[PDB]
Amino acid sequence: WVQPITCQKPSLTLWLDDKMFTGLINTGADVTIIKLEDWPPNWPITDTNPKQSSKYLTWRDKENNSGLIKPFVIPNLPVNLWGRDLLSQMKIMMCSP
Amino acid sequence: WVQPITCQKPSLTLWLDDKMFTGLINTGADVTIIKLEDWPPNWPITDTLTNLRGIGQSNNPKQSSKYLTWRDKENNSGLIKPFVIPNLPVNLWGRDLLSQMKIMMCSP
């Protein structure tokens, strides 16, 4: 797939351990941040300062590529933030004409 | 040019008016942020109440009073009006700038 960077929100939708999450492609962060309000409460979290998933989560995209991330879980943010931990596993390249 | 997304910092070096800046490609923000320590002090700023709390910044950032001409090393250029914020580790190139560079994200 291709996505131009525009003023619009650059979004990915994908699964983490078989639940769907949408969020903002966030090249400026090393790690992924999931909103606490979106966090399945049966899924265990631990402090580190911010909370983090206790378990690694399997991410899967709609083309069935997959891998592992261990996101931070943070209250009071507008959107999930896909970090380079995830983007680097999807082999995403930035290109200019 | 091509730049894969890796664990490493995705960086661009470019000019704003007559000065070179390096910073982090920051697709999560719609505005560009310059660290105050890198801000030429002769360049005028305006205090704002622009809420950037949502992109993990302040609710009262300074902003460049003027538009700045950005130019890359291939001599593409355009205009942005970045925020100027103390005590950040790196300059943050937002989609205001990235969208003027015609940057596409691609997957194999």
UniProtKB/Swiss-Prot annotation, chain B:
This is Protease 13 kDa. The active site is at N26 (protease). It is found in: Virion. Residues 21-97 form the Peptidase A2 domain. The aspartyl protease mediates proteolytic cleavages of Gag and Gag-Pol polyproteins during or shortly after the release of the virion from the plasma membrane. Cleavages take place as an ordered, step-wise cascade to yield mature proteins. This process is called maturation. Displays maximal activity during the budding process just prior to particle release from the cell.
